[PDB]
Design a protein around this ligand. Structure first.
Ligand code: CDL
Ligand code: HEA
Ligand code: HEA
Ligand code: PC1
Ligand code: PC1
Ligand code: PC1
Ligand code: 3PE
Ligand code: 3PE
Ligand code: 3PE
Ligand code: 3PE
Ligand code: CU
Ligand code: CU
Ligand code: CU
Ligand code: MG
Ligand code: ZN
Lengths: 51, 58, 151, 495, 88, 161, 46, 196, 59, 60, 91
């Protein structure tokens, strides 16, 4: 339609793709740490109360 | 695209002209002309084709 | 569509169509001609769509039957063959789906009920009594049915 | 009308036109899919209720075993391959490279009618005859040869069904490769043919290399049953049978999956109005998956007793195969980005379902690759969850994308989008309820191919009950939608 | 199907007009790609009734003495056909 | 005259599209019958006559299509198909060899007899030899097949040149 | 993109076509009982 | 809560590591897909040119590889950790899988009526903390001795004598199954092990 | 006078032109279709005999 | 704006389609859940699933 | 014009050799194929027959194999009904 936002290659890559990957990387690190703590209960000591 | 018209690719802005030229050939059964043939027999065959059509080599 | 035989005979090598007065169908096994009609894939659909019509009309019995056979034909043939060869399986299925068969259910008892959350966990389950007999539709459970003894 | 009847019969039996053979393959595939679905409903009704509610006797569990084996065989060899490869393969391959017919036009008809012969033999053997084959879809000896419930001839007829299906597949594969290699129109190089043709080529290469081994295995079974040899007996090598069968087994799996990738790529190009992101990357990944699938066959036998070195090697090779599929999934995700795919199209939403379900199934199957961890998950319901959330949610939804994209083109009538939305969404929700619980019932120890289970596993089967009802609703909706597709109006008045 | 061509109701005492016609309708289902619907409101016509209505709107709104047209039952409405442009 | 089409093989309808499948069906049901009742339904020679007769169709169409419809594109398609078929045959042979050498590469085995040295004069070479294998006759057969191969290769090259 | 055909023979309450649709697909009790929701405005020229 | 063995503990920890990795990847892709879909459905961010990016493609092919070598190494070490305890045993037990019942040292074990499907009349007894060797096979068809809570699942194949090493640390009764289609009574062929 | 030359020209100048080479041989087509018919009959009879258990020789 | 409340015409969804679609699918899920609950509360159940049995074998 | 002319009346070519056959054996490939055939015919074939001439009046002293022990005369009570109908080898 007439309201569709059309971006060139450079503009699209710079203003859409890269921030998306940046947010994805942040999510990756945060999820790794929070999941490891969620299961084992310790950030670096494996199972809690066991070792 | 239609056969013999001037067409324009407006993605690229290029003017082109398709054209179909039919492959009318003598029946390949060994009775092919071994030397330059004149327009008479060819005239008859072309007339018949243009009026009623000729089989396909399938 | 309509035959092209006049053109084929008046064409350019009519000797190729002499076979067409033998026991021979035009569409399948005759040399195609420069001026032949264009044959489509589903001729019924091809002829009906440009007129706005779907190929089959349910009001015509022949069309209704043809479409039923196309869509539901082999399905019902397989079902009928299975029911003929395994009458007891469908009998048991009908018994179970109609609440006629109860394995070892009693009267007035409560039974465990749990939807998800992994295997049976006593901290999540409920216990349910049969609403059918709470209302009164059920008073005793039939015993004439087949019973999986030794289970 | 004798001439008309005989002309129709000659049209649909003497044909060699790729379009007609394609529609015939599609019809047979859909019919066999419905039959497999009915048998699956029988299996589910057996599982949901307690106390052998359908068979009513422990002695008669052979009926349930026959159900599972025929469900597996019908849905693998007659539903997906005829549809995914037979239907769109024949209908589209000549068109996408600009040519009239496939090479070897007669072998195409021979392939289809071999498939029909196999279906006929199978249907007669496993319905009209008593005490049928009941040995699971992987016909492991000595259960399938030296047993008491498998003694009739119809078992041998089912093995011969496998033979004919193999013959049909080999013929089709050779034909596809040959047509794609030499009949391309001028100016089209081998690696510029569109994505679907390439995936079909690699699938055909897979089928050619493995089917003879399956033929050898089945001939071994037939010889053991008939001439009373000892290839797979107490003094034989049932493990040898397993090795051969599964050397065929995994190539069959990737043969099933790859054409779905090709079709989804093509349809995406057609509906998002944009080219494939990294088309060369996707083609190379497809060929990589094809090649790597020939070195991983023994990840289905981690508990047979393989050497420890072989266990480690096969876990490694399975991870290797896992890599390029991840590349393809990322390529799809980026392809959909920046595109203008239709916001209200069953094709679009079926693509979404395909992507999500394939990612989940691939992960769950990547857990099973580890030999050590396969100790706790072999022959439980985790494997069933895996290969049903791949087969019945990624392959089925890819075929739904193709179905809802190519119906208007083939028939020239648009699609009832609201109806299709109901069908696809209820199929999604119902199927997830059936198979997702299986995963957590596998980690809990529930074995597979059991009609009766311990009381610890009730919740999973209750959720499965819910899912089965939703599946019945969805499939009825689908069939009625298709019947409505080819039927003219039924009401009309003046407003 | 063959019904009446679209007409124009005109109420005398109130002096208010409006087009009308018979609208066929059917249960919704899939369409056909190779078919653009014909003229269904005015069957077997080149669809000139739209032009006649557009031309006649100024005549009708301005006030028309339609005593020479048939009435509709016992009401105050009369029917003007749109076969030809209305000038009066 | 005649209007010329593309270079592909157009395709003809033929009865081989179902006769070969019917032949396979006949063979398999005949085998089932022989397995069940231990007696053939029809004579084996009659069955082979039918099978031979149905397959004489291929050479006729081959001749009449090479006379009329043949070019280098078609010849290449045919030769490539031949190559694929030969590959399939090689794979079938490899599979049967797999099924053969499976229990011979695993040297350790349980044997009814003794194969330890120093208990008898002919026990060490017992498990290591299958003497009844028709050795020098197999050698003669191998010589015959070598004759055939070399003669055929020489003649093929001679005619090609 | 649809031609209704003959309006006369499809407007009846009970018809062979409607019963066939009920049996196989396309029509049902929801259409007789609730036409406002399942037939609604319908498809035609406006 | 005890573990019942060390091999099961190792397998569980490997499973947890893989679960963490896959959940992280899923969360990353979920965020990405959410952004993409939210932009798409509103008809925003359109670019028909964006059909190639060499750097991104190379990186996204490399990344799964480095995170996968770790998983492969961990899995291989877990396998060998399962298999080291062979040879340090002092008790041998032989197990035969008959048609719908088991045999331990020529003593038959069939399902009972006291328990629905789990309990057996004759269990199999092993001593706690004492390494034992199980020699498993079958007489008629293929079964599968499955005690997955101790990390044992080995097929009993006719004519093939498999040899697994079993060790117990927690005293009690472990319930297991046939875990391989064997006939009609496959679902009713349970396994009971008692560590005392 | 070469046999191959004569055979070719006969194929083009010797027989009524048939679109299908199998129809160029009138009797062989009859034989092949009869083979198809008897194979259908053979299949049906074998199916019937195997399932019912009476091999039709006693009747 | 044509078509019915739950269906549209051809490839055109009815107005406010997706809320209606989710609501109707939720209703179907609820009905099927009720059917499952009924078949579990009045269908075949073994004697080992009674409250007495499960409460006595859930202690030790 | 059409090549059919040379199909009908092909040219006749003069050769120096007494026959075409010899002309085709001045090519290295055919000579090497003939060499392979001669090698196979000369060495093995002539040698093989020589052996049956050299060992014509001597026995075969190979120790026979051991197939079936006496205690296994029943073959473990295994069904052996071949499809022919009788428990005998096709031979
Ligand atoms: C028993 C069931 C047998 C199979 C199903 C038959 C259905 C039709 C029955 C009927 O009364 O038809 C009258 C009806 C009369 O036609 P008509 O409407 O008067 O129009 C005249 C002309 O047909 C002119 O009309 P047309 O040319 O336009 O054709 C109309 C159009 C109408 O079709 C449509 O509109 C839809 C067609 C869909 C085709 C698939 C497309 C891709 C998939 C799309 C999704 C749908 C999937 C299928 C449905 C399930 C959906 C959930 O197409 C068809 O009707 C035929 C299309 C192909 C499908 C049927 C193939 C049958 C022969 C092959 C048998 C082997 C495979 C099946 C298993 C056996 O017949 C036909 O239309 C079909 C032609 C004849 C077919 C039979 C040919 C001989 C086959 C011999 C072998 C049989 C099997 C082996 C037996 C072995 C011994 C036991
Ligand atoms: C492609 C293969 C395929 C497909 C589609 C399916 C579909 C389904 N399967 Fe199954 N299944 C197998 C392959 C498949 N399956 C195999 C190989 C086995 C193992 C056999 C064995 O273990 O030996 C198996 C075993 C298996 C079991 C084993 C039970 C047991 O082992 O304990 C169960 C029970 O829950 C089950 C359930 C289902 C259900 C409920 C569906 C479906 O109802 C859910 C999806 C349904 C669909 C709707 C698909 C139906 C298709 C049509 C509707 C055609 C319409 C056209 C298209 C959309 C293209 N399957
Ligand atoms: C239908 C198609 C299909 C597909 C595509 C697959 C794909 C895979 N399958 Fe499976 N499988 C089956 C069909 C399929 N499978 C069937 C039918 C069976 C059962 C046979 C039976 O027993 O009857 C089966 C059984 C089966 C088993 C049997 C377990 C057991 O029986 O002991 C195993 C275990 O190794 C396995 C593994 C895999 C792996 C590792 C993949 C991989 O290809 C998956 C790869 C996918 C991805 C990895 C997704 C992409 C991931 C990302 C987006 C990035 C993440 C990447 C990394 C971090 C590296 N499959
Ligand atoms: C804040 C409310 C949370 C969501 C409300 C619903 C769930 C109730 C609490 C969940 C935790 C306890 C589990 C008991 C119930 C779980 C139900 C379930 O789906 O289990 C499957 C699965 C089974 O897995 P699980 O429950 O074992 O999860 C693992 C749990 N621990 C941590 C203990 C190991 O449940 C889940 O995944 C949990 C979330 C369910 C939320 C579902 C929302 C989507 C709805 C889709 C349609 C479903 C139709 C159901 C209709 C019923 C009513 C008409
Ligand atoms: C589970 C394992 C299953 C078994 C796997 C093993 C393989 C099974 C069989 C696969 C067959 C594959 C064939 C590949 C192609 C062969 C060559 C080919 O098609 O050539 C082109 C053609 C077929 O294509 P066409 O006829 O369309 O030709 C097109 C036109 N021209 C010729 C110009 C190219 O082949 C022939 O002309 C002859 C083929 C004859 C094949 C069958 C004859 C014998 C039938 C059996 C007799 C009884 C046996 C007992
Ligand atoms: C004539 C036919 C065509 C040509 C055949 C010869 C060339 C074939 C080359 C390709 C490989 C063929 C398939 C594999 C063959 C080996 C069989 C196999 O897998 O055994 C499993 C066995 C292992 O099985 P196993 O030993 O555990 O089991 C034996 C059976 N029980 C348990 C009952 C005791 O070997 C291997 O897995 C080792 C790796 C493969 C080794 C390949 C050996 C063949 C090499 C031959 C070279 C010499 C040929 C010329 C003389
Ligand atoms: C490309 C096509 C070939 C692929 C070859 C891939 C080889 C992978 C590793 C092979 C291997 O040894 O796998 C282990 C497996 C069983 O190992 P196991 O028997 O436990 O160990 C020896 C015990 N004494 O060993 C086996 O099961 C034996 C496998 C032998 C090789 C067969 C290869 C296929 C041959 C036919 C097709 C070839 C063309 C495709
Ligand atoms: C509950 C009572 C059921 C029995 C009484 C009769 C019900 C009406 C007649 C049966 C056929 C259904 C109507 C005709 C049709 O084509 O239906 C299509 C329907 C999909 O439409 P759906 O999503 O159900 O719309 C209603 C939303 N609640 O989907 C189907 O047709 C699926 C198969 C039939 C489902 C019947 C259940 C009620 C469906 C509403
Ligand atoms: C259930 C038990 C049986 C199971 C069997 C296996 C089932 C699986 C399917 C196998 C394949 C079946 C294929 C269809 C069989 C019928 C073949 C057929 O009708 O062929 C058409 C052919 C037409 O004749 P034709 O000479 O080829 O050319 C046209 C001439 N006007 O027809 C003919 O040439 C012959 C026409 C009939 C002549 C005799 C009439 C009496
Ligand atoms: C036209 C091409 C072929 C068509 C095949 C059609 C049939 C397909 C079925 C495939 C396999 C069938 C196997 C059944 C044959 C059993 C042979 C047999 O009994 O073998 C024993 C015999 C050697 O006997 P022996 O004890 O060594 O002799 C003592 C003194 N000499 O040893 C033998 O005779 C070994 C024979 C070779 C091994 C079989 C491999 C297939 C070759 C076909 C042989 C004939 C098949 C007969 C089948 C009848 C039904 C059609
Ligand atoms: Cu695999
Ligand atoms: Cu068992
Ligand atoms: Cu078992
Ligand atoms: Mg197993
Ligand atoms: Zn251009």
């Amino acid at each position: 339609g007439g309201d569709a936002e059309i971006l060139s290659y450079t503009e699209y890559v710079s203003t859409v793709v890269y921030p998306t990957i940046f947010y994805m990387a942040i999510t990756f690190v945060v999820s790794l740490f929070l999941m490891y703590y969620y299961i084992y209960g310790t950030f670096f000591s494996s199972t809690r109360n066991r070792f | 695209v239609p056969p013999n018209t001037l067409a324009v690719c407006i993605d690229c802005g290029i003017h082109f002209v398709a054209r179909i030229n039919e492959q009318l050939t003598f029946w390949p059964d060994g009775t092919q002309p071994w030397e330059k043939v004149d327009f008479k027999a060819v005239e008859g065959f072309l007339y018949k084709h243009y009026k009623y059509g000729s089989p396909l080599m399938i | 569509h309509g035959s092209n035989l006049y053109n084929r005979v008046h064409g350019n090598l009519p000797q190729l169509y002499v076979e067409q007065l033998y026991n021979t169908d035009e569409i399948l096994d005759t040399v195609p001609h420069s001026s032949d009609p264009v044959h489509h894939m589903f001729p019924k659909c091809a002829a009906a769509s440009p007129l706005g019509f779907r190929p089959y009309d349910n009001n015509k019995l022949w069309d209704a039957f043809v479409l039923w056979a196309i869509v539901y034909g082999v399905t019902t043939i397989f079902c009928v063959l299975h029911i003929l060869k395994y009458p007891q399986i469908w009998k048991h299925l009908f018994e179970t789906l109609t609440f006629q068969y109860t394995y070892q259910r009693e009267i007035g008892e409560e039974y465990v009920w749990q939807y998800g959350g992994g295997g049976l966990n006593p901290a999540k389950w409920r216990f349910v009594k049969s609403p059918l007999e709470e209302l009164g539709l059920v008073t005793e459970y039939r015993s004439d049915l087949d019973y999986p003894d030794d289970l | 009308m004798i001439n008309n009847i005989m002309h129709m019969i000659n049209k649909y039996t003497l044909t060699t036109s790729h379009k007609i053979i394609g529609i015939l393959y599609g019809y047979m595939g859909y019919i066999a899919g419905i039959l497999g679905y009915i048998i699956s409903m029988l299996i589910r009704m057996e599982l949901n209720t307690q106390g052998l509610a359908i068979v009513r006797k422990v002695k008669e569990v052979t009926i349930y075993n026959n159900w599972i084996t025929i469900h597996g065989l019908i849905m693998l060899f007659v539903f997906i391959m005829p549809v995914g490869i037979g239907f769109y393969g024949n209908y589209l391959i000549p068109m996408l490279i600009g040519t009239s017919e496939l090479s070897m036009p007669r072998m195409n008809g021979i392939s289809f009618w071999m498939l029909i012969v196999g279906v006929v033999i199978f249907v007669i053997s496993n319905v009209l005859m008593s005490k049928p084959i009941s040995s699971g879809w992987t016909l492991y000896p000595p259960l399938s040869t030296r047993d008491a419930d498998n003694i009739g001839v119809n078992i041998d007829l089912s093995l011969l069904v496998v033979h004919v299906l193999g013959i049909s597949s080999t013929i089709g594969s050779v034909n596809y490769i040959t047509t794609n290699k030499y009949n391309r129109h001028v100016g089209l190089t081998f690696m510029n043919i569109n994505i679907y043709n390439f995936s079909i080529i690699v699938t055909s290469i897979l089928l050619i290399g493995s089917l003879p081994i399956l033929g050898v295995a089945i001939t071994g079974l037939l010889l053991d049953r008939n001439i009373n040899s000892t290839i797979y007996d107490v003094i034989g090598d049932p493990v040898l049978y397993q090795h051969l069968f599964w050397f065929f087994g995994h190539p069959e799996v990737y043969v099933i999956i790859l054409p779905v990738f090709g079709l989804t790529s093509l349809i995406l190009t057609s509906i998002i109005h944009k080219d494939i992101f990294g088309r060369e990357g996707m083609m190379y990944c497809i060929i990589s998956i094809g090649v790597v699938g020939y070195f991983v066959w023994a990840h289905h036998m981690f508990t047979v007793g393989l050497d420890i070195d072989s266990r480690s090697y096969f876990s490694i090779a399975t991870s290797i195969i896992s890599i390029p599929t991840s590349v393809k999934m990322f390529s799809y995700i980026n392809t959909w980005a920046s595109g203008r795919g239709f916001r209200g199209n069953n094709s679009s939403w079926s693509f979404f379902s395909f992507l999500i379900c394939f990612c989940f199934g691939g992960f769950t199957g990547l857990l099973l690759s580890s030999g050590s961890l396969d100790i706790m998950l072999h022959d439980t319901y985790f494997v069933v969850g895996h290969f049903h959330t791949v087969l019945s949610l990624a392959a089925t939804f890819g075929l739904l994308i193709a179905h809802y994209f190519f119906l208007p083109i083939i028939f020239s009538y648009s699609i009832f989008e609201s109806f299709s939305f109901y069908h696809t969404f209820l199929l999604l929700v119902g199927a997830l309820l059936v198979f997702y619980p299986m995963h957590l019932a596998g980690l809990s120890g529930m074995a597979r191919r059991v009609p009766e289970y311990a009381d610890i596993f009730i919740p999973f089967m209750t959720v499965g009950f819910h899912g089965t009802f939703l599946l019945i609703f969805s499939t009825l909706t689908f069939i009625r939608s298709y019947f409505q597709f080819l039927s003219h109006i039924n009401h009309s008045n003046y407003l | 199907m063959n019904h009446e061509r679209p007409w124009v109701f005109l109420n005398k005492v109130t002096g208010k007009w409006g087009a009308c016609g018979w609208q066929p309708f059917w249960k919704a289902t899939s369409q056909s790609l190779n078919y653009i619907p014909d003229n269904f409101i005015a069957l077997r016509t080149n669809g000139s009734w739209v032009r006649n209505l557009w031309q006649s709107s100024k005549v009708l709104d301005r006030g028309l003495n339609a005593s020479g047209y048939p009435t509709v039952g016992t009401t105050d409405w009369v029917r003007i056909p749109l076969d030809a442009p209305l000038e009066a | 005259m005649i209007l010329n089409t593309n270079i592909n093989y157009g395709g003809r309808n033929s009865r081989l599209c179902y006769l070969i499948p019917l032949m396979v069906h006949t063979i398999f049901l005949y085998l089932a019958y022989l397995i069940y009742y231990n007696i053939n339904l029809i004579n084996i020679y009659l069955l082979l006559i039918i099978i031979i007769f149905i397959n004489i169709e291929w050479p006729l169409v081959i001749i009449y299509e090479y006379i009329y419809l043949t070019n280098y594109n078609i010849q290449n398609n045919l030769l490539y198909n031949i190559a694929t078929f030969i590959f399939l045959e090689i794979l079938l042979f490899i599979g049967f060899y797999w099924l053969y050498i499976n229990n011979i590469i695993h040297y350790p085995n349980n044997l009814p007899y003794n194969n330890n040295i120093a208990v008898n004069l002919l026990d060490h070479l017992n498990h290591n030899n299958n003497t009844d294998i028709c050795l020098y006759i197999i050698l003669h057969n191998l010589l015959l097949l070598l004759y055939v191969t070399l003669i055929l290769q020489l003649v093929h090259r001679y005619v090609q040149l | 993109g649809t031609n209704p055909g003959d309006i006369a023979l499809n407007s009846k309450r009970f018809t062979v076509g409607k019963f066939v649709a009920w049996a196989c697909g396309g029509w049902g009790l929801k259409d007789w009982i609730f036409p406002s929701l399942f037939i609604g405005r319908g498809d035609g020229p406006d | 809560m005890r573990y019942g063995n060390r091999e099961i503990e190792s397998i569980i920890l490997f499973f947890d590591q893989t679960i963490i990795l896959y959940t992280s990847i899923i969360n990353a892709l979920i965020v990405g897909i959410i952004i993409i879909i939210r932009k798409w459905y509103n008809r925003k961010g359109i670019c028909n040119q964006y059909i190639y990016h060499i750097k991104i493609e190379v990186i996204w092919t490399i990344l799964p590889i480095i995170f996968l070598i770790v998983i492969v190494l961990h899995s291989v070490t877990v396998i060998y950790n399962l298999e080291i305890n062979k040879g340090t045993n002092n008790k041998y037990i032989n197990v035969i899988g008959n048609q719908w019942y088991w045999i331990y040292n020529n003593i038959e074990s069939r399902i009972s009526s006291l328990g629905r499907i789990i309990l057996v009349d004759q269990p199999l007894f092993i001593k706690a903390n004492n390494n034992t060797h199980l020699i498993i096979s079958s007489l008629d068809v293929i079964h599968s001795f499955a005690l997955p809570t101790l990390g044992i699942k080995v097929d009993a194949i006719p004519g093939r004598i498999n040899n697994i090493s079993i060790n117990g640390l927690t005293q009690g009764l472990y319930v297991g199954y046939c875990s391989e289609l064997c006939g009609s009574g496959h679902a009713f062929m349970p396994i009971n092990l008692i560590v005392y | 006078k070469h046999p191959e030359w004569v055979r070719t020209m006969r194929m083009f100048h010797g027989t009524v032109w048939r679109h299908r080479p199998e129809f160029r041989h009138p009797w062989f087509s009859r034989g092949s279709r009869a083979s198809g018919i008897i194979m259908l009959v053979f299949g049906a009879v074998a199916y019937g005999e195997i399932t019912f258990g009476k091999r039709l020789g006693g009747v | 704006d044509k078509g019915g409340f739950f269906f549209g015409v051809g490839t055109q969804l009815p107005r406010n389609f997706f809320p209606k679609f989710l609501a109707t699918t939720s209703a179907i899920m609820g009905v099927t859940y009720g059917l499952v609950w009924l078949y579990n509360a009045a269908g075949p159940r073994a004697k080992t699933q009674t409250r007495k049995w499960k409460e006595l074998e859930s202690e030790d | 014009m059409s090549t059919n002319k040379n199909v009908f009346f092909p040219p006749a070519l003069h050769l120096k050799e007494n026959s075409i056959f010899q002309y085709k054996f001045k090519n290295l490939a055919v000579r090497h194929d003939a060499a392979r055939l001669g090698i196979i015919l000369a060495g093995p074939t002539l040698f093989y027959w020589f052996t049956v001439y050299y060992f014509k009046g001597m026995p075969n002293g190979l120790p026979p194999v051991l197939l079936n022990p006496f205690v296994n005369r029943n073959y473990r009570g295994q069904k052996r009904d071949m499809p022919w109908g009788t428990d005998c080898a096709f031979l």
